[PDB]
Symmetry: D2
Subunit: 726 residues, 4 copies
C-alpha cells in the first residue's frame, strides 16, 4: 500500500472550508448531493477502488512500468500493444478549444421558480413552484485560451444549461447587459481585433493592444460595452459576485399565443464585487486559476453560488416606446424604465467529477429554446443561431454531440436522424423517415398547445426588401455610454479613467490613442480630458465643444448600473489572512475566529514558514501558507493578532503583505503590539477609517472589521495610496 | 399516413422462411434471443412507438413538413433551428469506410468450447465447456467499397470479436489459409495494386486489371493466394459455406508457461460451397446484396450460421521440422501433416438492430489478444499489430473507439487514460497516473498467473542484428501453389484455368499476361499450357523444360484443400425456385413442399406476374417474385410442377430460367407435362444425371432431387454446357 | 482612407530596437532576409494591399458590415452565403493544441557547420562549412496550454527543424540534459501527474501541486530532472539565454559505416541567464507573453538568437 | 466540414478559384495560405483597410442581393400554390 497508514490522503466527504482538505471530484466530496441530471450521469461514471488495471479492451496489465523489448537494454518491439494503446490515447487527448470563451469553470445545481408564470409563458420549467430543474453552469472569460488566466480584464460569460422536461434550454449570457457590435456578420472582425494579433499571437487575455483599440476607434457602436469592460465590471472578485444578463430581447409566449418581449437577468445573492486593476493583474501571476479555485472551494465549503433569475418584460405594443431600439444589442434597458421582475432561484451545489468530460465537452447554444420562448430579429442574436450548432462539428467531432453525457437531455428525445461519427444511440425503429406506414408513423409530430405541445414560431409580421442594411434606429452610439458613466460613483469613474489610460498606454501607434480620445469627447468631456491628461494629449477647441449626447428617456442616471452606489454586501464565504507570529496572544485569536465563524467568513493562518507555531498558552497553531505563498491578493482583509511582534516586525514579506493589502483598499485590523505595523503603511496615531485597531481583539474590534468587510473595500483610502511604494 | 388495419406492415417476431415477412432489426424480430453482450447494449437501444418526434435536444416538433419562412412563398429564415439541426445531422452522417474490407455483413452469436483446453492454454474463454462467450462476427470482401457487390471474385474476411471475461479477443481471419505477401511493409503496395487504379478509379471489386497482374508477375510470393482467388474459393455461395483461417502462426501459453504454436480454423457446419464464375458475376448485377441478404434471412429463418473452431498445434521443438517456414504467411500447413483439432462451436443467432451503429462502427484488430494467447515473429502479423489501432483514429474519430457500444468489453476496464474526442466515461478516480498514493494506487497491476492474471509476453529468445532483410527460408514460391493445384478435382482445375484466363484477358498490356503465364510454368506445365492456350500464347521450349517445384514434405496432394473432393453437403437453409402455372397440380406441390420442409429447404414461388394464382383444388398461391425478378442465380435448384404447362411453355423468361440454371450446374426437377421443357435444355428421353423427372412429384422424385442438392452442383454436366446459348 | 496621413501606421522595414516601431509579420519587417525554405514558402504567402475583399470562392463583397435580412429590422435570411461562409470559417478556426509543449514561440534561421564532419558522419548537412541549412526553431514550455504564461517554472523545449538536401532532420530537445523518466511507457503517468489535476483542471503552468510531488516521491528516477527544474534553470531570462540538449544518445554513422555514440548540445552565444523566482512569478501576471515578445523583438532588432 | 476536414476546403487544389481571393478569415485545419496582412479584421487602419469592399457595378463590382419584396408572417407552411 502506497497510501499513508493514517488515511490522510483521502479528503473528508463533508463540507469543509477552503484549504482544510485537498479538493476532490464532486461525487466523492459530496456523495449525498443529487438531482435528476446527476442521477442520469451515473451510467457513465467509472470508479477505481479495488479494480485491476486493464487495457481499454479489458485485458489485465501485469507490468505498467516498462515497454516490451528484446532484452532489458534492447529495442522496443512493435508487438507491444499495451504500450501503443496507452501512448495512442495520450497522443490524442486534446480537442479544439472553444473559439471564444475557451477559459471557463463549471458546476452542477438546480433551479426552481418562485411561482407559476403560466400567465406570461407556457415554458414548463417555469410552470410550477415545485418543479425543480437541474442545471449545469459554465462561467468564462472571452479572449484567452483554455490555459489563460482567470482575473484578466475581459467580459465574462455566464451560460446555464437547464435540463427541462420539455427539452434543453441554454441561457447563454454575459456579465454585462450589452455587446460590442450590432450585427453578427462583424463577429469575426471584432473577435480577431481583440484576440492575440496574428503575426506573433500576442497578447493573451488582454484588449490592451493596437488592433483592439483600432477597431473600437473605427466602430463607435462598441463604446457602450468598452465602457463596461474598462470599469471594474471587467475584473470581478468571484463568479459568485457578478451580474449576468441574456444580452438580447427574446420572447415569452403564453398558452393564448400572446408574445411578451423579455430580457434575462441573473442577480448574485452574494452581492456585486470586483477587484482593483493592480490587484487583478498581479493575481493573474500569483494564481492564474483564482476564480476556478474560488468557485470549486465555495461549493466544497457549502458557500453555494446563488443567483436570482429576473425578467425585464415589455409588452409587444411598447416595442417603439423608447429612445433606442429594443433589438439593438448595444443598448441596455434601464431598470429605472423597466424593472426586473424576480422569477426564481438557482443554486450551484456540486462540482464535476472530471473537468474534461463535463466542463470542456459541454456545449451551450442560445438557439436551444423550449415551447414558451421564442427569438426576435436582434441581428446579433440572429447570427448567433447559426454559429453555436456549426462550431460543435469540429470542436466535439460531429453532429452526435448531444450524446456526450453532459449534453444529454433528461427529457425524451426520438427522431429519424441517424449515423454520424461517435454514434451512441442504436435505433430500433424499422423507419428512418416520415411519413412512414411501416412503424405507424412513430415517433409522431405533436400539435402546439398549452403544455407538452410541439414548438411553433410566433407568427411575427415580416415586411421589407432583401437588404444588407443597418437599421437607422441603431445609429446612435454615445448616449448609453454616457448614462453608464454618469451612473457610476466618483471612485468607479476614476477606475474607468485609469482602465482606458492604462490600455491606451499599451497601444504603440499614437494616432489610435488620439482617435479613441476623440470618441470619449463624444460621450463625456470630463472622462475625455482625464484620459487625455494621462496620455499627454490635449483636447482641441472643437473637441472641447462637442455637444454631449441626449439623456436616455429622460434619465440622467440609473443607480442599478453601478457596482457600489447601492450597498449589497455579503460577507459569507469571504476570506481573511491572519498573520501569525512565534508567540501569538491566544485570547486575540480565539476572539477573531469565533466572530469570523459566526458570519461564515474563512481564515488562513500565515507565517514565514510551514509547520506549526505555539500560542502564549500552549495552543498549537497549524500554518496554511507563507506570506509569499498566499499573498494578500487572495484574501478580502488582513488581521494581525498581538504577541511576539518582534518575530515578524522586520520580515520584508510580512510588511509588504500589509502594504499590498493597503494599496488595494482592503480592511486591515491590528491588535495590541501589531499596531507597530501602522508605521509601515504610514497611519497616524489617532488612526484612520478602514484600519481597525485596539489593545485586544475584542469588545467591538471584530464587529468593526466585519462592517468594513460588508462594504467590500475602503474607497476613502484612494487618495492615500499613491504615496505608498507597493 | 398510417399502418394498414390488418397489421401486415409488422413482421412476426418468430422464425420465418426467406421472403415470408419483411426483414426487421434483430431485437424486434427475435426479442427473446439474448446473450450478455446483447443485453449490455440495452443502455443505448432507442425505441420509437408512442414517442413524440423531437429535436436532439428533446424539443417536440409540431411541423416536420416545412421550413420556417417569411410568408408561405417566402425565403427560409436563419432562426429555423429545427431545420438546421436536422439538416446538419444529415450532412455529417458518413464516416470514412475501412481502407480494406469496406464491404461486410455482420451478426451476433455465441461460442463455447467442447472441452477445457487448460493443458495447452490458460485463455479463460477456452477453459470450461459451459462458459458461453458472446461474439459479434463480420464477414467481408477485401477490395471494394462499402457500396460494392457481394458475389465478386475476391478473398473474404471473417472477423470474430469474442467478448471474454478476461477481455476482448478479436480473431481477424480470411477464407483462405495464406496471404499474398510476406512482409507488412509491402501491404500498401499490394493493396494499391489490387484496388481501383489511381488515375480513373476502375475497376471496383475486381483484380482483373493491369496493376494487380503487374504486381503478381513481379512478386512470385503472391502466387499461392492468387491460386486460391482464381479457384472457386474466390466466389463463395454464402458466408455460411466457406472456411475461415487465422492466416498466421500464433502461440497458446498454458499455466505452466509452455508455448505451443497454433494456426486457427473455422469449419462451416453447413459445408463448403461456391458459385461458378458466370453466375457470380451476373449475380453482382441482379443482386449486389446477395450474401448480405442471405446471411440476414438465414438468421431470421433459424438456419443459424454455425462454425467449428479448430487448431493446428505444433510443439515449440517442431518449429523447423517442415520444408517451409512456420512464420511465412504465404505457406499453409497441410492438414495431412498437422491435423485440425476440434475446439468448439460458434452459432450466429441474431442480426443487429442498426447496421451503421453496430456493423459499420465495429473495430476488430488481431492485436486484441488475452492471457493464454501470444504472437509470433510472422513479419506480416507483426506489422498488422501497428495498423489496426492506428486506422481507428480517423475511421472512428479518435482514441475512444472502445466506448462505441458494439466495441465495449463486457469484462471490466479501468485505467489511467483520460480525455480524447467524444469521451463517454466520466472517471471519478482522484488519480490519473500511477504509481499514486492518493487513490492507494488503484486501479492496480495484477501479476500473471493461471487465471485472471495480468498479461505477460512469452519470453521468446531474440538473437540477430537490426536488419531489413527477408528470411532466406521464405524464398520459395512455387511448391504451395502446386500442392494446391494438384489437390483440386478436375472440374476445380478447369475453373482455376478459366479464372486466370478470364482475368488475364482484361489485362491490356500483353507482356504482363506473358509474364504471368511464365510464372504459371514454374508451378505446373498443364495449368500453364491451358491458360496460354486461352490467351493465344505459345510456351517456349525453355518454358516447357522448367522443373516442377518439389513436393511439400512428400505430399502429392491434400484433399482438404479441395472444396468438393470429400463430400460435406448440408441442404438445410438452401432454397429452391418453384415455377408456377395458372393451374398448378396441388398434389405435386403438396409433396414438393412436404419433402423440402422435412430437410429445412426453402422455396420461392415464381410466376410471370405478381399477385396470386389458384391451384387445381382452389388453393390460393401468393407469388414471391416474377421469373425475371428472382432469377435462377439466387436459388440452388429449380422445380417445375405439373398443371397448365401451356400457360408457361412459350414464356421466354420461364425457358431462360431453366437454361440459366442448367448452364450453372444446378439440379432441375420436372413433373408431368413440365417434362416438355426438356427440349429447351436438350435432355434426351432416357434422361440425364442431374435432371429429375417423373409423371408426378412423389417420394422418389423429391428424394432424388434432394440427393442432387446435397452434392451442390452437377459437375458431370460441364461437357454439355458449352453449347447452350445462355 | 483610414490610415493616418503621416504613414505612421506602418513599421519601418529595417532593424529597430524594442518598442521603437509596432512589430510586423517577418516578410514585411525584413523582406530581404532570405533562405531556401523562406523562399519556397513564397507560393503560399498571400498579400492584401490593393486587393478586393472576397469570399473564399473569389466573389467580391460589397457590404462587409451587415447580414442579409427581410427589411433593415427583419430576420436574417438563410440565403446569406457571405455571412455563413465568414462565420463557418470563424467557427472552425481552432485545432487541438499539442498534448505537451502547447505554449511555444518560433522563428526562421539558418545553420552552417564550422568544418566538414565526414570522418564521423555522412549527414549531408554536416559535410562542408559552405552548406547552409535553413531551420525553423520552436521554443516552448511543457505543461501549460497554448494560452498559458511564458515565465513559469517548467522545463523548456527547444526543437529545430533542419531542411537538409537529404531530408528533414528534426532535433527535438529540451533545456536540461536529462528527463524525468526512464521508459516511454510511463510518459502519460508522469505528464498526467504534472498537468492540471483532472477533477478541477488546476493548476496551470505549475508543478506545485500534490499529484506531481506524489509521483516524484514514488519514482526516485525523477529526482535528477526535478533538481534542474527547481534550480533557476527552470526560469530562464530568455530563450536566447538557455542551453539546449538532445536528451538522448543517438549515433553518427560515417561513409565506412562506423557508429559513434553522440549527445547533442546547443550553447547559447548570448550566455546563460535566468530570472529569480519572485520575478518570474510576478512576470507571469505583468506580461504572460514575455519570452514570446522578447524573441520576436530581439530578431526585429538584429539581436539574432545564436547557438553553437 | 466533415467530408473535407474543415473550412479550408477551397484551398484543396481542384476547388481553388482562379480569380483572386483575399479576406480576413484565418486559421482552421489544413491551413495552406500564409497571410502577410498586418490586419485580420475590418475596418482597420493599420493596413489602410485592405482588402477593401467593392460597390456593385456593371463589371468587377461586389455582390449585392436583388431587393426582392418580402411580406408575410414567420410560418412553417407549404404554399397552397404547391398543392
Ligand atoms: C449575449 C451573451 C453572448 C453574446 C451576445 C454572444 N456570446 Fe458567444 N459564442 C459563439 C459565437 C457568438 C456569435 C457568433 C455572437 C454574436 C454574433 C456571440 N457569440 C455573442 C460561438 C463561437 O458559437 C461559441 C464558441 C463556443 C461555443 O459553443 O459557441 C460562443 C461561446 C459563448 C459562451 C461559452 C459557453 C460555454 O461553453 O461556457 C458564452 C457564455 C457566450 N458565447 C455568450 C455570448
Ligand atoms: C529530450 C527532449 C525531449 C524528450 C526526451 C521528450 N520530449 Fe516530447 N513530446 C511528445 C511525446 C514525448 C514522449 C512520448 C517522450 C518520451 C517517451 C517525450 N516526449 C520526451 C509528443 C506528445 O509526441 C509531442 C507533443 C506534440 C508533438 O508533436 O510531439 C512532444 C512534444 C515535444 C516538443 C515540442 C516540439 C514542438 O512542437 O515545438 C519538444 C521540444 C519535446 N517534446 C522535447 C522532448
Ligand atoms: C499491415 C497491414 C495489414 C495487413 C498486412 C493485413 N491487414 Fe487486415 N486490415 C488492415 C491491415 C492489414 C487494416 C488496414 O487495419 C484494416 C481495415 C481497417 C481496419 O480496421 O483494419 C483491416 C481489416 C481486415 C479485416 C476486416 C475486419 C472487419 O470486418 O472489420 C479482415 C478480416 C482482415 N483485415 C483480415 C486479414 C488477413 C487474413 C490478413 C492476412 C494475414 C490481413 N488482414 C493482413
Ligand atoms: S448581448
Ligand atoms: S494470412
Ligand atoms: S531526454
Amino acid at each position: 500500500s502506497l497510501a499513508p497508514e493514517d488515511g490522510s490522503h483521502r479528503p473528508a466527504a463533508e463540507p469543509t472550508p477552503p484549504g482544510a482538505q485537498p479538493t476532490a471530484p464532486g461525487s466523492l466530496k459530496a456523495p449525498d448531493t443529487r438531482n435528476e441530471k446527476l442521477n442520469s450521469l451515473e451510467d457513465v461514471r467509472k470508479g477505481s477502488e479495488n479494480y485491476a488495471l486493464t487495457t481499454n479492451q479489458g485485458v489485465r496489465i501485469a507490468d505498467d512500468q516498462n515497454s516490451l523489448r528484446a532484452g532489458s537494454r534492447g529495442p522496443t518491439l512493435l508487438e507491444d500493444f499495451i504500450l501503443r494503446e496507452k501512448i495512442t490515447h495520450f497522443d490524442h487527448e486534446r480537442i479544439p478549444e472553444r473559439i471564444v470563451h475557451a477559459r471557463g469553470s463549471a458546476a452542477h445545481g438546480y433551479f426552481q421558480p418562485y411561482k407559476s408564470l403560466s400567465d406570461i409563458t407556457k415554458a414548463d420549467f417555469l410552470s410550477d413552484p415545485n418543479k425543480i430543474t437541474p442545471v449545469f453552469v459554465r462561467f468564462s472569460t472571452v479572449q484567452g485560451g483554455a490555459g489563460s488566466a482567470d482575473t484578466v480584464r475581459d467580459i465574462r460569460g455566464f451560460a446555464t444549461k437547464f435540463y427541462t422536461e420539455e427539452g434543453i434550454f441554454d441561457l447563454v449570457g454575459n456579465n454585462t447587459p450589452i455587446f460590442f457590435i450590432q450585427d453578427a456578420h462583424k463577429f469575426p472582425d471584432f473577435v480577431h481585433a481583440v484576440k492575440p494579433e496574428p503575426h506573433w499571437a500576442i497578447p493573451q487575455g488582454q484588449s490592451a493592444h493596437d488592433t483592439f483599440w483600432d477597431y473600437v476607434s473605427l466602430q463607435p457602436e462598441t463604446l457602450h460595452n468598452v465602457m463596461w469592460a474598462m470599469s471594474d465590471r471587467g475584473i470581478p472578485r468571484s463568479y459568485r459576485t457578478m451580474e449576468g444578463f441574456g444580452c438580447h430581447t427574446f420572447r415569452l409566449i403564453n398558452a393564448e399565443g400572446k408574445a411578451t418581449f423579455v430580457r434575462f437577468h441573473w442577480k448574485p445573492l452574494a452581492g456585486k464585487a470586483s477587484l482593483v486593476w493592480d490587484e487583478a493583474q498581479k493575481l493573474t501571476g500569483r494564481d492564474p486559476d483564482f476564480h476556478r479555485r474560488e468557485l470549486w472551494e465555495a461549493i466544497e465549503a457549502g458557500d453555494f453560488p446563488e443567483y436570482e433569475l429576473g425578467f425585464q418584460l415589455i409588452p409587444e405594443e411598447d416595442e417603439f416606446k423608447f429612445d433606442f431600439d429594443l433589438l439593438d444589442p448595444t443598448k441596455l434597458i434601464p431598470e429605472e424604465l423597466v424593472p426586473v421582475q424576480r422569477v426564481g432561484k438557482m443554486v450551484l451545489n456540486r462540482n464535476p467529477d472530471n473537468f474534461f468530460a463535463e466542463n470542456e465537452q459541454a456545449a451551450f447554444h442560445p438557439g436551444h429554446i423550449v415551447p414558451g420562448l421564442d427569438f426576435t430579429n436582434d441581428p446579433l442574436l440572429q447570427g448567433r443561431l447559426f454559429s453555436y450548432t456549426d462550431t460543435q462539428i469540429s470542436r466535439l467531432g460531429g453532429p452526435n454531440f448531444h450524446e456526450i453525457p453532459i449534453n444529454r437531455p433528461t427529457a425524451p428525445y426520438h427522431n429519424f436522424q441517424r449515423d454520424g461519427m461517435h454514434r451512441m444511440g442504436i435505433d430500433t425503429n424499422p423507419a428512418n423517415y416520415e411519413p412512414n406506414s411501416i412503424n405507424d408513423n412513430w415517433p409522431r409530430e405533436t400539435p402546439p398547445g398549452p403544455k407538452r405541445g410541439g414548438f411553433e414560431s410566433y407568427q411575427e409580421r415580416v415586411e421589407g426588401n432583401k437588404v444588407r442594411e443597418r437599421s437607422p434606429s441603431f445609429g446612435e452610439y454615445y448616449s448609453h455610454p454616457r448614462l453608464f458613466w454618469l451612473s457610476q460613483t466618483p471612485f468607479e469613474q476614476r477606475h474607468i479613467v485609469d482602465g482606458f489610460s492604462f490600455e491606451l498606454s499599451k497601444v504603440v501607434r499614437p494616432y489610435i490613442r488620439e482617435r479613441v480620445v476623440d470618441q470619449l469627447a463624444h460621450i463625456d468631456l470630463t472622462l475625455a480630458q482625464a484620459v487625455a491628461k494621462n496620455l499627454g494629449i490635449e483636447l482641441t477647441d472643437d473637441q472641447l465643444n462637442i455637444t454631449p449626447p441626449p439623456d436616455v428617456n429622460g434619465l440622467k442616471k440609473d443607480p442599478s448600473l453601478s457596482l457600489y452606489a447601492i450597498p449589497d454586501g455579503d460577507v459569507k464565504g469571504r476570506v481573511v489572512a491572519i498573520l501569525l507570529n512565534d508567540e501569538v496572544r491566544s485570547a486575540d485569536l480565539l476572539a477573531i475566529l469565533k466572530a469570523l465563524k459566526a458570519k461564515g467568513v474563512h481564515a488562513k493562518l500565515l507565517y514565514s514558514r510551514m509547520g506549526e507555531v505555539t500560542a502564549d498558552d500552549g495552543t498549537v497553531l497549524p500554518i496554511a501558507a507563507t506570506f509569499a505563498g498566499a499573498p494578500s491578493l487572495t484574501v478580502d482583509a488582513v488581521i494581525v493578532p498581538a504577541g511576539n511582534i518582534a518575530d515578524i516586525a522586520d520580515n520584508g514579506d510580512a510588511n509588504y503583505y500589509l502594504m499590498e493589502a493597503y494599496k488595494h483598499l482592503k480592511p486591515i485590523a491590528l491588535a495590541g503590539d501589531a499596531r507597530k505595523f501602522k508605521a509601515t503603511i504610514k497611519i497616524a496615531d489617532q488612526g484612520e477609517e478602514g484600519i481597525v485597531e485596539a489593545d485586544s481583539a475584542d469588545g467591538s474590534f471584530m464587529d468593526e472589521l466585519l462592517t468594513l468587510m460588508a462594504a467590500h473595500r475602503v474607497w476613502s483610502r484612494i487618495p492615500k495610496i499613491d504615496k505608498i511604494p507597493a
